[PDB]
Ligand binder design. Structure first.
Ligand code: PW5
Ligand code: FE
Length: 222
């Protein structure tokens, strides 16, 4: 689909109704696999962190580490398709502008590329923006070809505010996910038993981020 049709006819109404929106086959197999290739290249060349310290043993050789991070601006050599992805996310958001909540999105973060190494680690339940830091939408792109969560785990489980039920999102290849970043969407990553990659950017609301800057401060000489 074109960004505009998908945004107007699916993403906006879905986000406003549920605060979670799943878009399958966002870029298609060729581009998706190119992104996968770049992400794996970054991994294989050591551009990721060693991963979140999960268990700190008395000894450190047996330390267990979870999700590995790298921040990608999108102009880096070898990250050209990632930059293409980020631009396509941005086009999708731009063609929603004004219609997602009352938010006026005026910026985003760089891309946080995560790699769960497949050793059983996941990510604890949390809220992305609990303190009013300006992030209003979480956007995640999944690159894991033929992911079977029944075997490999790694479901993102969201606990939408004031609902008994979970929303389980499998980290399926070429899948794009949006959710409100605030307390309406606590979530966790269930233990991943295979290598799981995802690419996250957060979009800022202009007003929230403007007054976050006020409360959190940016110093000029007298
Ligand atoms: C380090 C860090 C990771 C995440 N990632 C996820 O919630 C997982 C989404 C997915 O991969 O499905 N969120 C925050 C607020 C921080 Br900080
Ligand atoms: Fe999160």
């Amino acid at each position: 689909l074109p960004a505009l049709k998908l945004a107007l006819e699916y993403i906006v109404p879905c986000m406003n109704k549920h605060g979670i929106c799943v878009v399958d086959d966002f870029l298609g197999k060729e581009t998706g696999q190119q992104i996968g290739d770049e992400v794996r290249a970054l991994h294989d060349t050591g551009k990721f962190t060693d991963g979140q310290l999960v268990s700190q043993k008395s000894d450190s050789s047996k330390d267990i580490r979870g999700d590995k991070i790298t921040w990608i601006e999108g102009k880096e050599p070898g990250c050209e398709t990632i930059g293409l992805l980020m631009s396509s996310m941005d086009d999708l958001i731009r063609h929603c502008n004004g219609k997602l909540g009352s938010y006026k999105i005026n910026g985003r973060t760089k891309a946080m590329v995560a790699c769960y190494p497949g050793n059983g680690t996941g990510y604890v339940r949390h809220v992305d923006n609990p303190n009013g830091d300006g992030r209003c939408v979480t956007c995640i792109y999944y690159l894991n070809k033929d992911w079977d969560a029944k075997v490999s785990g790694g479901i993102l489980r969201i606990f939408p505010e004031g609902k008994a039920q979970f929303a389980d999102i499998e980290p399926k290849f070429d899948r794009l996910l949006f959710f409100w970043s605030d307390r309406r969407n606590p979530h966790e990553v269930q233990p991943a038993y295979a290598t799981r990659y995802a690419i996250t950017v957060w979009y800022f609301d202009a007003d929230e981020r403007a007054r976050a800057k006020v409360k959190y401060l940016v110093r000029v000489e007298l």
